[PDB]
Amino acid sequence: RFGVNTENEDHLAKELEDLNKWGLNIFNVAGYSHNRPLTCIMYAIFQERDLLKTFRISSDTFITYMMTLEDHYHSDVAYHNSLHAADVAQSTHVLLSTPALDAVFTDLEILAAIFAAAIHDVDHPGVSNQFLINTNSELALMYNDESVLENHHLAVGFKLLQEEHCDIFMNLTKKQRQTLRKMVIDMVLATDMSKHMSLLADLKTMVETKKVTSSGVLLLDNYTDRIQVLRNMVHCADLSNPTKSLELYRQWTDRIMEEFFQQGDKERERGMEISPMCDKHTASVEKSQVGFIDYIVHPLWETWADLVQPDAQDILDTLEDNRNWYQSMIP
Numbered sequence: 001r002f003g004v005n006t007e008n009e010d011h012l013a014k015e016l017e018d019l020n021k022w023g024l025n026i027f028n029v030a031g032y033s034h035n036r037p038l039t040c041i042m043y044a045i046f047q048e049r050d051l052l053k054t055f056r057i058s059s060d061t062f063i064t065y066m067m068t069l070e071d072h073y074h075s076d077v078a079y080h081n082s083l084h085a086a087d088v089a090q091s092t093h094v095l096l097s098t099p100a101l102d103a104v105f106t107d108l109e110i111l112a113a114i115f116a117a118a119i120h121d122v123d124h125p126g127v128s129n130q131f132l133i134n135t136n137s138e139l140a141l142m143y144n145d146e147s148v149l150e151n152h153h154l155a156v157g158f159k160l161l162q163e164e165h166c167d168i169f170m171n172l173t174k175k176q177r178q179t180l181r182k183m184v185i186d187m188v189l190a191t192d193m194s195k196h197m198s199l200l201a202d203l204k205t206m207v208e209t210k211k212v213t214s215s216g217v218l219l220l221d222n223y224t225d226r227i228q229v230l231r232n233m234v235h236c237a238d239l240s241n242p243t244k245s246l247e248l249y250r251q252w253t254d255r256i257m258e259e260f261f262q263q264g265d266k267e268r269e270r271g272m273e274i275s276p277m278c279d280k281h282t283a284s285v286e287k288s289q290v291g292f293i294d295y296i297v298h299p300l301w302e303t304w305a306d307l308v309q310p311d312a313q314d315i316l317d318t319l320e321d322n323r324n325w326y327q328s329m330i331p
């Protein structure tokens, strides 16, 4: 089905043993599956959690949909291609298994979070919301300058479900489809970085009033509480590159800066003001990664670590180490 060469056969399976671990190498997975990491990992994650059985999704329909989804990720965009969506989906799969959230979420909520991660950047053009708005692009006109890309990703992901041969949610009840849709919209719209501060603040509240039962698991009474953790989960996963091993983090940084600089060039050709971190002639990649961790990634992930204490300590230590590595690359 994947046509994985007889030579990449066991290499792939050897990589997929780390499926449930933070240390999984999605680059290795993309290379052994003929650059189909999103399809590959999503199939693996769905078999592990036995989601195909629970929601009666035929294996053919699942593959057909994921393949088409993966094809809507642009392979010429340096960072926001299917490897990132696969990375965010697999990272979310690991966060959902963290001991402090054990048995807290329904199967339907697990399905929604992983599906959301998978579609969260589909058909990304390699430019930011602010670029699309400043250039009066069709998408900004379409979405009235609000969470332009995030709304688009959702629109494409759900639209690919319209044909029967691609409808993975055909066996959910009407009710389940409507709840899953609400959760997915919510989670994907929350990946808009302009909502980041609002999200971090609400998560700090959740940590302050966190009630963990005798089982050592968090108590989340209402839907409001659960979707609040899920939004933050996908958001942390989206901002997890600097929490990975240094070998992986540096390749992600290479990819993001290649995309950001490409937008700098486009802004320069059009006579627009260049965002300072986006300017290949002046910006220090190393200073920007240090600023990224101190002011965005560390504040979020330390808060997340508090809520799931102590499951995330390794993540925090890797983050401080990677930060110090980039700081040591600045003269």
Ligand SMILES: O=C(Nc1c(Cl)cncc1Cl)c1ccc(OC(F)F)c(OCC2CC2)c1
Residues within 6 Å of the ligand: 191, 192, 193, 238, 239, 241, 242, 249, 251, 252, 253, 254, 256, 277, 288, 289, 292
């Ligand atoms: O913003 C990001 N991601 C992103 C998210 Cl989480 C949500 N919405 C849009 C984007 Cl671009 C993002 C992701 C990864 C980065 O570096 C490394 F980890 F690869 C990075 O560098 C900051 C810095 C150079 C100026 C920025």
Ligand SMILES: [Mg+2]
Residues within 6 Å of the ligand: 120, 121, 149, 191
């Ligand atoms: Mg995005």
Ligand SMILES: [Zn+2]
Residues within 6 Å of the ligand: 084, 088, 120, 121, 191, 238
């Ligand atoms: Zn993303």
